[PDB]
Design a protein around this ligand. Sequence first.
Ligand SMILES: [Mg+2]
Ligand SMILES: [Mg+2]
Lengths: 409, 410
Amino acid sequence: KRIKVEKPVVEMDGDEMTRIIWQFIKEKLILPHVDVQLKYFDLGLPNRDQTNDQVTIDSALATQKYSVAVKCATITPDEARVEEFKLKKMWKSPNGTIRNILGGTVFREPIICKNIPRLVPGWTKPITIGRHAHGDQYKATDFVVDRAGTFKLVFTPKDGSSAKEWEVYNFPAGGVGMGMYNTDESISGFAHSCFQYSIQKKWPLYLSTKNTILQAYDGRFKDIFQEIFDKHYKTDFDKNKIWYEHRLIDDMVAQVLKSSGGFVWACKNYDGDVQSDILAQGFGSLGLMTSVLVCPDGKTIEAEAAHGTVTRHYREHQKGRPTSTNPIASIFAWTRGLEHRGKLDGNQDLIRFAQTLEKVCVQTVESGAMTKDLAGCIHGLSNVKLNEHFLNTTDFLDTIKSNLDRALG
Amino acid sequence: KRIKVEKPVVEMDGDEMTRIIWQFIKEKLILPHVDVQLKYFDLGLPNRDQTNDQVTIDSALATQKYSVAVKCATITPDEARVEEFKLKKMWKSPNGTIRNILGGTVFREPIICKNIPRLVPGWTKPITIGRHAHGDQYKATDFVVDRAGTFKLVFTPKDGSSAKEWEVYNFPAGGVGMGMYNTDESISGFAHSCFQYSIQKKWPLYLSTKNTILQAYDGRFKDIFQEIFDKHYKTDFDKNKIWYEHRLIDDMVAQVLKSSGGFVWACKNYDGDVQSDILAQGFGSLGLMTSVLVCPDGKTIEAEAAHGTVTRHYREHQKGRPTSTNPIASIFAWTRGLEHRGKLDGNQDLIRFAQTLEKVCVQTVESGAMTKDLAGCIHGLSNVKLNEHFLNTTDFLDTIKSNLDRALGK
Ligand SMILES: [Mg+2]
Ligand SMILES: [Mg+2]
């Protein structure tokens, strides 16, 4: 019997090869077991252009309403994509837009498969990055200086007090300038979520900044975290034999590499983007990773596939040929979506299905049935072969489907 | 008989554990075998405070004059350091101030010992990071927003063109803002350095940015590198079977961790700081890495230890507790300083001494005498033990001192 879900799930469609596997996953794994009401938004690049990127804002507003989104990987366009898709604007990142509106922390962690070898031998336990999802480089204003001139910052107070101007630089010739920001509210919510997840895991927490160089900007991150820790969380950290410490970013990453894992890592928005990929790759593969935005309100989430759209595999699919594409991150976006939908509704049957599918995915890879990229981690890309070391995208999903049916019975 | 050194070498002194190691090296390893005139500048935090940070500017000026600096790792103040040292102001990064005056690229690579298992087993060849030494976070203007108000950017052209304003954010409550920049001239020189270094090494080059998010700012880096590649280097890269590619920083770092090395990695100022510590640590230790600021003119350099002051080892050493800090990167700052001084003057004995001291360091570790960090790579950090697997800071330095005297004795 299919599990009845009462409240809706927001579904965000994607691009190229991820768009196609997103549909297979829905057909083969999700819908045959779950009767769920889907609130569809096409964040494919053609439709984002068609709606002047308004579909992206509505998908986020819908997520605030219904409290659970699941997202397919999308194209953030450059010059090349603007020419290829004939876009009228170089539209901003859908991910950055959705994260800004919703706010909160993007938690990312590996999907550990026993047989997929780590590139960092020392990491015996997993690590979780809490990436702050708001502000900084993902809400910056930047520009090209094409001639001599003065660049300055200006802060005009609301209360009526005098404006403060800072002369940033008197450009003699061309260059670039940018401004970015963040709020106390956004940093406080970011801190709270990280402290709570650390208690939940029984793991210590590390904040990373460069407050020696950005003494006001990064110092505020250090100050707010240490304030919230002292007043709200120090007692709960002591009871669980865990701690909190601020580290300089360059010191942190070395320490992380030397570690054995088993900690939470609060990263700034930019650092989260960079270091989550070092984490994913170090644990075995970029495709073996979850990514879940947890909003400040505690109720709303957005689960996503954090990787790209796999353009090379898509081109082959256009020419009627078979591909071998890892669907696990996309699968885990659905399960994390459905699990939280089940938590809010009090639907234990749904929660159990999501966890069962996550386990079946790992077991299928651990049994030796896998896609080309994962088989390449084991035997090397030069030594792998079809129906010997790896399977087609749909065949792997069909293997996952068979194992999912056996587990449920 | 000391080696006479005709011309001076600028010396920048530092803080905490590196300051103590710096003085051992100067006193006991360098000037008993090298008659060298040192233009001494104390960039220890108390003297920077004493001089209103002018000594930092004066050290940078002196490096331009004599073309060679050797620097000890320094403290950059935050709020805690103002309390600690009772500072007049929250002074800026002296490395920032030095790098901004001198300009150039900071080249960073591992110091390889056959004896030391990597944390990243895949990296069978070394990797060099060309770090851009100018602009971005290290020249930024940042501030605390402590009341409601609007933050904007304003560009006013010098020759009468229309001025442009951009609203960054309307703050309802408290927060933070910042503005930063870089220049076409600085980024072009950064490209030239990295392309030239790549052709020397016969290695491919990668530039990392986030041009998909920072369309203008990071796009400018991508465009200038590509123009300069096609105008000056593309032919030579193709002839030498090497290549240049741009990659998104997040894509790049994953590629690095999975690679087997053998490439140059052009990093922006911020990225180069973070990624150079990943690199040193992955090859074995923060103590086994060189760092050289190569200026545009092709003559001036500043050699340093990439790693910090080792504050956590300094707190133990202050209270008399056991300590084992790796001095090799700090020694290699002296040797690359002297080697370059020797190369400029045509002083062959001074070049040989520098290289002899580098061989002594590597052969000392390769013979089984080492500091804790390196012992941990072999035996595991949770099983190493004082005087069984590793030596003290002083006992390891005395071992370098003993082996050095024996080396040039032979
Ligand atoms: Mg990323
Ligand atoms: Mg550093």
